[PDB]
Amino acid sequence: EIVLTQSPGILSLSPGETATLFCKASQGGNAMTWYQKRRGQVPRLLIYDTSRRASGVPDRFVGSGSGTDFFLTINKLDREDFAVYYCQQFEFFGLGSELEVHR
Amino acid sequence: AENLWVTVYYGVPVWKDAETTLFCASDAKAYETEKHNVWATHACVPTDPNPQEIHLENVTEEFNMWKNNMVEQMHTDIISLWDQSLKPCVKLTPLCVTLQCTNVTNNITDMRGELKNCSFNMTTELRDKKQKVYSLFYRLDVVQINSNKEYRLINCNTSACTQACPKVSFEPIPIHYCAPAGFAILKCKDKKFNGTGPCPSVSTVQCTHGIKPVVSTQLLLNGSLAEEEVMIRSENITNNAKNILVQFNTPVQINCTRPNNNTRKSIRIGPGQAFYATGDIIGDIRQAHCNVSKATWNETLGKVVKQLRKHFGNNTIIRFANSSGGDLEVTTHSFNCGGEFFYCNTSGLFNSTWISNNDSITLPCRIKQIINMWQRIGQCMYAPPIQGVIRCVSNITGLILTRDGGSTNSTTETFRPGGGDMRDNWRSELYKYKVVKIEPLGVAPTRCKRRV
Amino acid sequence: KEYRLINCNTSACTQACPKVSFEPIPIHYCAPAGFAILKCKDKKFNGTGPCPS
Amino acid sequence: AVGIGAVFLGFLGAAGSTMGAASMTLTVQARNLLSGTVWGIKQLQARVLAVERYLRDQQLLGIWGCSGKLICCTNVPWNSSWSNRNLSEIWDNMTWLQWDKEISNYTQIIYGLLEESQNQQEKNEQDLLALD
Amino acid sequence: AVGIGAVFLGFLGAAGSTMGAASMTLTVQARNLLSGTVWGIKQLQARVLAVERYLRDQQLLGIWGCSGKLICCTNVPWNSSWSNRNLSEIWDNMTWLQWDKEISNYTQIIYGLLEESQNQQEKNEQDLLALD
Amino acid sequence: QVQLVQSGAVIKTPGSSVKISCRASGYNFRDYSIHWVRLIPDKGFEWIGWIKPLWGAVSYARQLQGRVSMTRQLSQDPDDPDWGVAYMEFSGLTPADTAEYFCVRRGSCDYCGDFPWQYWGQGTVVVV
Amino acid sequence: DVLMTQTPLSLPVSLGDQASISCKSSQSIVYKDGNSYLEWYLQKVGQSPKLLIYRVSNRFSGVPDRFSGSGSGTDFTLKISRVEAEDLGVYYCFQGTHLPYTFGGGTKLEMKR
Ligand SMILES: *[C@@H]1O[C@H](CO)[C@@H](O[C@@H]2O[C@H](CO)[C@@H](O[C@@H]3O[C@H](CO[C@H]4O[C@H](CO)[C@@H](O)[C@H](O[C@H]5O[C@H](CO)[C@@H](O)[C@H](O)[C@@H]5O[C@H]5O[C@H](CO)[C@@H](O)[C@H](O)[C@@H]5O)[C@@H]4O)[C@@H](O)[C@H](O[C@H]4O[C@H](CO)[C@@H](O)[C@H](O)[C@@H]4O[C@H]4O[C@H](CO)[C@@H](O)[C@H](O)[C@@H]4O)[C@@H]3O)[C@H](O)[C@H]2NC(C)=O)[C@H](O)[C@H]1NC(C)=O
Ligand SMILES: *[C@@H]1O[C@H](CO)[C@@H](O[C@@H]2O[C@H](CO)[C@@H](O[C@@H]3O[C@H](CO[C@H]4O[C@H](CO)[C@@H](O)[C@H](O)[C@@H]4O)[C@@H](O)[C@H](O[C@H]4O[C@H](CO)[C@@H](O)[C@H](O)[C@@H]4O[C@H]4O[C@H](CO)[C@@H](O)[C@H](O)[C@@H]4O)[C@@H]3O)[C@H](O)[C@H]2NC(C)=O)[C@H](O)[C@H]1NC(C)=O
Ligand SMILES: *[C@@H]1O[C@H](CO)[C@@H](O[C@@H]2O[C@H](CO)[C@@H](O[C@@H]3O[C@H](CO[C@H]4O[C@H](CO)[C@@H](O)[C@H](O)[C@@H]4O)[C@@H](O)[C@H](O[C@H]4O[C@H](CO)[C@@H](O)[C@H](O)[C@@H]4O)[C@@H]3O)[C@H](O)[C@H]2NC(C)=O)[C@H](O)[C@H]1NC(C)=O
Ligand SMILES: *[C@@H]1O[C@H](CO)[C@@H](O[C@@H]2O[C@H](CO)[C@@H](O[C@@H]3O[C@H](CO)[C@@H](O)[C@H](O[C@H]4O[C@H](CO)[C@@H](O)[C@H](O)[C@@H]4O)[C@@H]3O)[C@H](O)[C@H]2NC(C)=O)[C@H](O)[C@H]1NC(C)=O
Ligand SMILES: *[C@@H]1O[C@H](CO)[C@@H](O[C@@H]2O[C@H](CO)[C@@H](O[C@@H]3O[C@H](CO)[C@@H](O)[C@H](O)[C@@H]3O)[C@H](O)[C@H]2NC(C)=O)[C@H](O)[C@H]1NC(C)=O
Ligand SMILES: *[C@@H]1O[C@H](CO)[C@@H](O[C@@H]2O[C@H](CO)[C@@H](O[C@@H]3O[C@H](CO)[C@@H](O)[C@H](O)[C@@H]3O)[C@H](O)[C@H]2NC(C)=O)[C@H](O)[C@H]1NC(C)=O
Ligand SMILES: *[C@@H]1O[C@H](CO)[C@@H](O[C@@H]2O[C@H](CO)[C@@H](O[C@@H]3O[C@H](CO)[C@@H](O)[C@H](O)[C@@H]3O)[C@H](O)[C@H]2NC(C)=O)[C@H](O)[C@H]1NC(C)=O
Ligand SMILES: *[C@@H]1O[C@H](CO)[C@@H](O[C@@H]2O[C@H](CO)[C@@H](O[C@@H]3O[C@H](CO)[C@@H](O)[C@H](O)[C@@H]3O)[C@H](O)[C@H]2NC(C)=O)[C@H](O)[C@H]1NC(C)=O
Ligand SMILES: *[C@@H]1O[C@H](CO)[C@@H](O[C@@H]2O[C@H](CO)[C@@H](O[C@@H]3O[C@H](CO)[C@@H](O)[C@H](O)[C@@H]3O)[C@H](O)[C@H]2NC(C)=O)[C@H](O)[C@H]1NC(C)=O
Ligand SMILES: *[C@@H]1O[C@H](CO)[C@@H](O[C@@H]2O[C@H](CO)[C@@H](O)[C@H](O)[C@H]2NC(C)=O)[C@H](O)[C@H]1NC(C)=O
Ligand SMILES: *[C@@H]1O[C@H](CO)[C@@H](O[C@@H]2O[C@H](CO)[C@@H](O)[C@H](O)[C@H]2NC(C)=O)[C@H](O)[C@H]1NC(C)=O
Ligand SMILES: *[C@@H]1O[C@H](CO)[C@@H](O[C@@H]2O[C@H](CO)[C@@H](O)[C@H](O)[C@H]2NC(C)=O)[C@H](O)[C@H]1NC(C)=O
Ligand SMILES: *[C@@H]1O[C@H](CO)[C@@H](O[C@@H]2O[C@H](CO)[C@@H](O)[C@H](O)[C@H]2NC(C)=O)[C@H](O)[C@H]1NC(C)=O
Ligand SMILES: *[C@@H]1O[C@H](CO)[C@@H](O)[C@H](O)[C@H]1NC(C)=O
Ligand SMILES: *[C@@H]1O[C@H](CO)[C@@H](O)[C@H](O)[C@H]1NC(C)=O
Ligand SMILES: *[C@@H]1O[C@H](CO)[C@@H](O)[C@H](O)[C@H]1NC(C)=O
Ligand SMILES: *[C@@H]1O[C@H](CO)[C@@H](O)[C@H](O)[C@H]1NC(C)=O
């Protein structure tokens, strides 16, 4: 099977800064899909095929990476963008990176 | 001579990838048995009797059968032509009527239906009169709408359906694809060609090989077989939604039949319209079946298990299961045989397990008379019954598989049959081809001038 | 007695609309481009063989 | 046996051979470019598309200095930033497929220069015959 | 801004400019002349009509002395009763629309004279190369 | 647009069976696959199975076979050829299956694969 | 690739009987000429191989008339009228249209005792 390790588990930031979340796989040579899930709502597609944004997604969500290292960078954070982020490759999902307010 | 003056060249061999329409070319030998017997004996050009491929040299072209456009044009052309071979035939609107059905005369055991003896009113040549008439329908074509019971046909809820004229045969004739002017068709020839990537030995050709169009779901029949060894093909093997095509080396043989000696009977629905009904079952009531050789099938599964262990690791437990479920003609094995559509249960082949180190298999078959292939909105057809016991013999060229798996790291890899899209049956015969566009105007430097 | 039409045994038949006349109008055959149409003019032309005019 | 030379006089056989050897058998790609009720409309539309493509290429070749010539010569010089490779390697080593994907950005510039060259050649020829 | 010169290199932009300035941008009307189930038949019939018109004009231009030339020169002299206007006013003042409606009666005479000129030029060329 | 309406929340007993109806509207339902996925609280996501509604060929996860069945219902009238219904019947319920069940559809792009999930369902809450 | 096989593989045939060996073609062998370019080869041991006949019908000059060949595009065969001692050797079927040129296996006609 495919095991996806997703880190950092909890990322505490303030708005305006840049977030970086990296997903490690077991096999290489495939794509990576990045989902946004706010609290108490429906999940949302952000990134498919490791670098392409979904429809209705602003350009501040950038994703890249290759092989095993898969990077998701969110520069210029918003008050709304604080949520949970998942990496899904095929049917094997990640566990979740929570994005928290720092004070 | 340090200066170089630019020169144009018109007619230079250089191509770029493009997509266009391709005109089909059937062989003229089918014209010797003329008069609309099979389709495209009139709507198709005869071939060049001298096909001539031209083997190129030191050339590399990237092939990709999964993003091919020629298979999509073939899937459109067969549907459009198949609809164009039903418009002159009789529409079966007036037969959609309340049926009064009973069991067929048989020592009924209280565990099977499978035949129904249905009497109903029907119009005549004249408009005023009417006639009581009986027929034999299968159980998959009648539905109890709510003494003897009271049924109706299944297509009556949505759409009346044209029956197929028995002058029109269903059997495949080989369809060639001659490229038009300006374009060209390449051909891989590498025996180890995976399906995607560079084929380092190509050959242009003006018109493709013999493609006989079969229609089959679980395992494709009469399909050009590979030469060196049994091969598998996919798009991403670690993906689940994509099928895993398999093409054999040795054609395992299947024999299929229908033992019931029917009697075709003509009923005149209307003036100039005749309806063909199953009149009587003389002989004996015996269920339709298929046979393959058990030893060659065990050997052929041994070959495909030997091939599948490369992509998955040498220590895995490959096992085969029957279909997961769904509609009828994706779980069972669908094909046509002498103009009558079988549906054959294939759980008797797909149960095994495989660890790292004479007889013949019977398998039952069920028959529908109405069919709805390609799943349109309001078009089915009523395949008329055929006189006498029929049987047909076919080589099995390959089969279509499907892997599954959610989680929990087990060493097994259960494979199940597929079907679904009809295009996969064409992607096992247009894999080695690619269409290209000539751009014959190239430009280059050399030392010359033009004299004023 | 009790009759029926003769075409009822095989096929129903479209009747002709009386706006459509049946009378002939002269039909000419103009040759397309690239081809040509010859014409014999010999008054003793048998039907087969050379027409020398 | 047919013979391997029948490959080179065949259609598109020189596609892998060098640029200095495709010019001899360059006329076969020129010749097999042209000749070769819904199905009638599809085949008719494809055939008129092929002859429109051939006529577009003949018109684009005729407004240069070579209306009916397979090989031609012009009067505009090569900017060295176009391909910066000498004569012997682009006529004895490379194939045309590799050459087409090395100058694929600069082609419209070349066509504009050829159009300007033929325009000024026409006005110079008119000025030369004007004095007589 | 695009620029007003893009009018003149545009299609048919020189239609109001003088006859001495339309000859530079004369190739755009030449280029945009060719390229550009009942609806399929209408569009197909219109497209083959356009290419038949272009091929008729190329054949009528090829039986003169200029098969692939936009500008040409001939060997027949102007009868003075045709237009009786000197050189400077028909190349710096007038437009082509006005010129076409001043010689509209005499055009078939001109085409017959050109056909005779090319015929006698061909037989003179054959007589010149016959002696060698 | 593309809409994926589900059925409401449901309360079931251990040993029972639940049926969830994912109605899809806005595209040609006879073309694109439907997937089913479930959010277990404090355990993550887990895939269930896919279904191709042209015929109804389905596949399921390995650790859910013998427990889940999926069917579909096409639309047969030519005046509304677009809408369609998917059905998931999940049997053998335990208190471990208290979760939130989603039906999804593929990305609509010709470049995207099968598992990138653009459109989502509203969310069926299942409490055992 | 258009590889062929040879049925049979070795026939010891007495001096004066008819021998017939077939080669079966996977793909058809038809050129733009129309004539099926197949050649029949004989090789006496330790030598250069000769040519028995041409396409199906024409014959290599310097060969007697004890050889005949037949075929109809798909499967080909020979008929040797009389057997000699020089007819010992290895026979082949050869293709001339598609690349690479394929061969048959090779047959060795022997003696009977
Ligand atoms: C995978 O590929 C395989 C390989 O092709 C497929 O198997 C084939 O399936 C076909 C079904 O579509 C099947 O065709 C049917 O055959 C029936 C059997 O009769 C034929 O065979 C016998 C014995 O082989 C032969 O003797 C007959 O005629 C021979 O001689 C005449 C001379 O007059 C020839 O004209 C004829 O071509 C044939 O030639 C033989 O000899 C020559 C040498 O001289 C050889 O060169 C030939 O190769 C051949 O060996 C029969 O031809 C037959 O009954 C069927 O015909 C009926 O149906 C068709 C419509 O499909 C219709 O046009 C016919 O006219 C006829 O209908 C009429 O009769 C019916 C009965 O009375 C009646 O009900 C109707 O209303 C009509 O009145 C049809 O020809 C074919 O046999 C098998 N192949 C084999 C080897 O068995 C397989 O199907 C493929 N898989 C899939 C999934 O499709
Ligand atoms: C599907 O279902 C339909 C009904 O929905 C069914 O059709 C019916 O089949 C039965 C047979 O199972 C038919 O019944 C027989 O009909 C024949 C023919 O009738 C003609 O002759 C009579 C003579 O008086 C005329 O009046 C009449 O108008 C017809 O012209 C009769 O001959 C049969 O009688 C024999 O069988 C009786 C059974 O009890 C005996 O008692 C009787 O003595 C007769 O036997 C004699 O004749 C036999 C035949 O020669 C011979 O074998 C015996 O030894 C003896 O000499 C019987 O009435 C019925 O008519 C059919 N109905 C219609 C409308 O056609 C299909 O058969 C059924 N098919 C399947 C596959 O299930
Ligand atoms: C059908 O068969 C074709 C072959 O004809 C397959 O296509 C290729 O398959 C190979 C392996 O099967 C793939 O190769 C892998 O590529 C990785 C990416 O590196 C390449 O690309 C970069 C640029 O992106 C180049 O700079 C680099 O040099 C490579 O060219 C490699 O990282 C992989 O390395 C593997 O081996 C090393 C050591 O051997 C290990 O350490 C690695 O972990 C890894 O296992 C590998 O070389 C190649 O990408 C495929 N190409 C394409 C176009 O698909 C098909 O996959 C196959 N398809 C099916 C359905 O069967
Ligand atoms: C026409 O069809 C009928 C269908 O009912 C058929 O009747 C059955 O025939 C069989 C064999 O002739 C009878 O015998 C059965 O088969 C074996 C014989 O050893 C036994 O094992 C069976 O016992 C089981 O079934 C019994 C009844 O269900 C149970 O009581 C018992 O405990 C076993 O479970 C059984 O004896 C069978 O009895 C009849 N059925 C009836 C209802 O009589 C008939 O033979 C067919 N005739 C023709 C001419 O085709
Ligand atoms: C694949 O194989 C499995 C078993 O190997 C098949 O499952 C079997 O399905 C049938 C019905 O489809 C079950 O039959 C039973 O019939 C009786 C009488 O009608 C009814 O009372 C039962 O409720 C049941 O329907 C059978 O028990 C079942 N077997 C098992 C072990 O569950 C499956 O059908 C096969 N797939 C295909 C496509 O054939
Ligand atoms: C798929 O293949 C397996 C074989 O691996 C099939 O299992 C076989 O099932 C039959 C009966 O269904 C067994 O026959 C009898 O079984 C009893 C036990 O109840 C036994 O005591 C008898 O002696 C008799 O053999 C058969 O033994 C069994 N095979 C093995 C190796 O044990 C299975 O039925 C196949 N699936 C389908 C749908 O056919
Ligand atoms: C399915 O594929 C098999 C290949 O395993 C085909 O079997 C072989 O087919 C060829 C030609 O179709 C047969 O050759 C024949 O040889 C006899 C010898 O006298 C000759 O008279 C014939 O004209 C023909 O050349 C070959 O014998 C046959 N092999 C076997 C074992 O039967 C088969 O034809 C394919 N199709 C079907 C429907 O099975
Ligand atoms: C024809 O002209 C275009 C325009 O310059 C050329 O495209 C350029 O190609 C180079 C590669 O040789 C690109 O450089 C690459 O950029 C990416 C950007 O992230 C970088 O990651 C790579 O490491 C590499 O440096 C360049 O960006 C690209 N230009 C543009 C504007 O995208 C093209 O190569 C020319 N054709 C030929 C045959 O030279
Ligand atoms: C091309 O040649 C034709 C043929 O001569 C020219 O047509 C002629 O045009 C003049 C006008 O400039 C006509 O004169 C007018 O006649 C009417 C008759 O009632 C009179 O009322 C007017 O006052 C005026 O005099 C002349 O009749 C006419 N010729 C014929 C035979 O009708 C034509 O003008 C020439 N094209 C050009 C551009 O010059
Ligand atoms: C026709 O076949 C059906 C199906 O077997 C018969 O209907 C029932 O069959 C079951 C056995 O599965 C019996 O237990 C019932 O008693 C049958 N119902 C009746 C009303 O008899 C049916 O009997 C058969 N015959 C007819 C004339 O319909
Ligand atoms: C068309 O008729 C069929 C046959 O009755 C209907 O299918 C049945 O529908 C009922 C209730 O909708 C189900 O309980 C049955 O299981 C269905 N049977 C089959 C074989 O599908 C169908 O609903 C009708 N459709 C329309 C649009 O009227
Ligand atoms: C399928 O049917 C064919 C034709 O009946 C079988 O071929 C014959 O089989 C018998 C033995 O059953 C042999 O004696 C014959 O020599 C075979 N003839 C040919 C031409 O092959 C074939 O065996 C059947 N296949 C299976 C798996 O039963
Ligand atoms: C169509 O109907 C005509 C009219 O009855 C039939 O022609 C008669 O057939 C009978 C017996 O076949 C003959 O005795 C008469 O002489 C025929 N009359 C004429 C005018 O031909 C004809 O047989 C019917 N055809 C079909 C196919 O039903
Ligand atoms: C087929 O034969 C192989 C060889 O022993 C064996 O391992 C396998 O279990 C057999 N399978 C069947 C279905 O007989
Ligand atoms: C797998 O096992 C086969 C045994 O035939 C061997 O040839 C192959 O090299 C092995 N490959 C790996 C990756 O272990
Ligand atoms: C110039 O041409 C010679 C062959 O004539 C070649 O050896 C040399 O490499 C070329 N120079 C360059 C810079 O390519
Ligand atoms: C001749 O040309 C001159 C200009 O070069 C012009 O002024 C004059 O009017 C012309 N003569 C006639 C009769 O048009």
Short mmCIF file of C-alpha atoms in Angstrom, two decimals, chain A residues 2-7 21-27 32 34 66-71 87 89 92-94:
data_model
loop_
_atom_site.label_atom_id
_atom_site.label_comp_id
_atom_site.label_asym_id
_atom_site.label_seq_id
_atom_site.Cartn_x
_atom_site.Cartn_y
_atom_site.Cartn_z
CA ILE A 2 0.91 3.70 0.15
CA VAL A 3 1.53 5.47 3.46
CA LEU A 4 1.36 9.27 3.44
CA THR A 5 3.08 11.04 6.31
CA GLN A 6 1.94 14.65 6.60
CA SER A 7 3.90 17.18 8.61
CA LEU A 21 3.20 21.82 4.61
CA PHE A 22 5.02 18.76 3.29
CA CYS A 23 3.66 15.30 2.52
CA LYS A 24 6.03 12.32 2.30
CA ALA A 25 5.02 9.24 0.32
CA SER A 26 6.34 5.69 0.13
CA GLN A 27 6.37 5.10 -3.62
CA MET A 32 -0.39 14.51 -5.27
CA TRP A 34 -4.27 18.77 -1.77
CA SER A 66 8.58 15.61 -6.90
CA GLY A 67 9.33 12.02 -6.07
CA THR A 68 8.55 11.72 -2.37
CA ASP A 69 8.76 15.32 -1.12
CA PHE A 70 5.51 17.17 -1.86
CA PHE A 71 5.26 20.83 -0.84
CA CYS A 87 -2.87 15.19 1.02
CA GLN A 89 -2.74 10.29 -3.51
CA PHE A 92 -4.65 6.59 0.49
CA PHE A 93 -5.26 9.75 2.46
CA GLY A 94 -3.16 11.76 4.84
#
